Amino acid sequence: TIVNRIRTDVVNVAKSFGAEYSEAVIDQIFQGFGEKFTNTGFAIRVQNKRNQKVDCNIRYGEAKENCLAWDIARESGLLSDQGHPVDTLIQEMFQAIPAIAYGADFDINYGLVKIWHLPKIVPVEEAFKIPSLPKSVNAHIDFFKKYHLDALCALTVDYRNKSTNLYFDAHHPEQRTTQFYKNILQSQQFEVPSDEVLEILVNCPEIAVTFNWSSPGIERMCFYTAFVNRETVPQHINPVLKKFAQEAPALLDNPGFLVGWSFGPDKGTYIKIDVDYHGLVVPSFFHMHNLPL
């Protein structure tokens, strides 16, 4: 079956990359969501957040108007009460902004980590009326304006990290210059990457900003870049990129990949890479940012 092939590929990724994982957690996740993984925008992610350690997440999105993952996880026990503002945040999001898609993210050592909300691109102001958002979000209004973070294309709730992300379509011409990325990173006293990386960031169609309930500042931000196949991934920049690009499983022979370039105070600076397991994620990314496939 597809679902068994997916589960096998996921375990094999975790073994090959030495990622921590729990067979019992994988069982919970697949009992809840394995069918969803066979039928929708599924991806396997590795990232190198922690020191000399790769973590593995599995994720999916589908074009439903309602947050089916929240219902499945609550009914399944994969999502329990947190005693925290995250408890209702997803619900608020779907009540406050119409959704054209949803998705969910799972750490295979843990369980459900995040749920997300994909509306049509709307002005970021529509987020400020979500009650349970951390206060730092509405406090960054002038920040969003200045850096052309006006076109909100997604929201995520991170139940494990106790954080939320706002995602922006990076449509503005200034976001086509490297000085934009040096500026936006410097404004938070984040690490500035090499010139080559910056030359990669100028093409990014999507910028994520992470807020939390423990500081008034931005926790991290992330720049997403898609690549149509294994070869066009900048494999020379980091060994995890090379290895995952060359060895990641998919139901296609030469699948595409989504690379997130994350930046923070220094931790927060690292790479994430997702394999387009079914071939749907990358055309979705381009289409959702009004770009030719």
List residues binding ligand 8P6 (CB under 6 A).
41, 43, 59, 61, 63, 101, 103, 118, 206, 224, 258, 260, 274, 281, 284-285, 288
Binding of ligand DST by 144 (CB under 6 A): no
Phi (first) and psi of residue 102, to 5 degrees? -140, 170
State in angstroms the smallest separation of the CB of 272 from ligand DST: 6
Task: Output 208 or 275, the one with its CB closest to ligand DST.
Answer: 208
State in angstroms the smallest separation of the CB of 60 from ligand 8P6: 6
How many residues are recorded in the chain? 293
Q: How many CB atoms lie within 10 A of CB 19?
A: 20
Task: Output 52 or 118, the one with its CB closest to ligand 8P6.
Answer: 118
Binding of ligand DST by 156 (CB under 6 A): yes
Contacts of 75 (CB under 8 A, 6+ apart): none
**Which one-letter DSSP state was computed for residue 236?**
G
Binding of ligand DST by 90 (CB under 6 A): no
Binding of ligand DST by 36 (CB under 6 A): no
Task: Output 130 or 280, the one with its CB closest to ligand 8P6.
Answer: 280
The two structure tokens encoding residue 191: 């690490």
Of 165, 175, 225, 269, the one binding ligand DST (CB under 6 A) is: 165
> Scanning the structure block, which residue is given the tokens 């720049």?
223
Binding of ligand DST by 114 (CB under 6 A): yes
210 closest CA partner among 59, 49, 40, 72: 49
First-to-final CA distance of the chain: 30
User: 226 and 273 in contact (C-beta within 8 Å)?
Assistant: no
Binding of ligand DST by 284 (CB under 6 A): no
Where residue 105 falls (left for φ over 0; alpha for ψ -120 to 50; beta otherwise) is beta
State in angstroms the smallest separation of the CB of 142 from ligand 8P6: 26
Sequence ranges of the binding site for dimethylallyl diphosphate = 45, 59, 114, 165, 167, 220, 224, 272
Q: Which amino acid is at 99?
A: A
Q: Which residues bind ligand DST (CB under 6 A)?
A: 103, 105, 114, 116, 154, 156, 158, 165, 167, 208, 210, 222, 260, 272
